[PDB]
């Protein structure tokens, strides 16, 4: 009846998407010999993705994998950039694959290994199963299971996604903990009876952008890294 | 070329016969009664398959495989006078062995070698909760855990194989079904998967003859996961 399973958000919470897109974007453009502002490109790509995602959620657009939403959002924002028209379909697939390569924060893999020695661990994020699987494999991020909202064709904070986690691992809400750096996610899981752990990610949107990392009253745990979370949960190995 | 391998679990990777017999023998010892546990595996699977088909044929609303295994245990225990000396709590605990199945000796090394070259995942009929526990307890590494529970069905339903392709994001010809059961490889093959058969001559113990013969439609035929790893260049 204690804590039995931890479920992890992925983007930002475990992986530094900002550094992935910007650093690999810059290499991509530098070799082709054109100037590009990958900070702006990254922010626009995310905004267009989330706008189209919101249209999928509302039913305005037909359901599709997040991989395709990113790929189509990429076509949209590239029209804002004169060099974008020079990028062929294979060039755009290459850029889009970066979202399946998001690199871990330097604390993520060792903290995940420690937590897995004491708990059942699983992802629980909104991205496609295919991309979360590859992110975990490429980052050598250990998990007992890979779950995403794709499996119920939805998105957090939809209660179905949290219930998916409880049904798949076979535990009750009070035996589960949602781990994220996004407060909407923890608020929703807390209302459904989960324990919640907040991981402060002050560089989620790059080294220079202020992010909301302040503690909240309803957090069971407040940590600055997955390693620190493991320490406070007494998780070794 | 090949991108991902999907593994059946019971029999293919883990020895449920020995798990049943040795945990059963432990249960009978503490409670102070004797029982021929060598035949219980056969009985339990039979009762289970019958009750499962009640879910499959729609005679019963969908329920977890672990629940069905728990009810099948009531079924077989009513056939033995010693069954009554296991109360509901004992049967609950006994039924939990299906989340604790012991790997064959070749399973973990073979799985680790294959994962260094390919994406790897379970794809079996049991509950997500049990397969996850089996793999965790047995230190079986995978990139993902999938079971037919995620589409509330069972192999050979094409939805289960499509779940595997949709989840890993690949095409059928880039995927390989790995199993010691021919109905499973037959269905996956017809859907364009590659297939690999692992012969498991002791799946039902040392005293029963099981079908381990090769078939022409098998892309690979092996006697262990380690042997399959060698065939796939995952040395
Ligand atoms: Ca895993």
Author numbering:
A (entry chain A): 40 to 276
B (entry chain B): 41 to 275
From the article:
All these three CESH[L]s exhibit high sequence identity (>60%) with L-2-haloacid dehalogenases, which are members of the haloacid dehalogenase (HAD)-like superfamily.
We also constructed an inactive mutant, KlCESH[L]-D48N, to obtain the enzyme-substrate structure because D48 was proposed to be the first step catalytic residue. A product molecule, L-TA, was found in the substrate-binding site of KlCESH[L]-D48N, which was present in the crystallizing solutions at a concentration of 0.2 M. One carboxyl group of the L-TA is fixed by N165 and Y223, and the other carboxyl group is mainly fixed by the nitrogen atom of the main chain of V49 and Q50. The distances between the L-TA two hydroxyl oxygen atoms and the side chain oxygen atom of N48 are ∼2.5 to 3.0 Å, supporting that D48 is the nucleophilic residue in KlCESH[L].
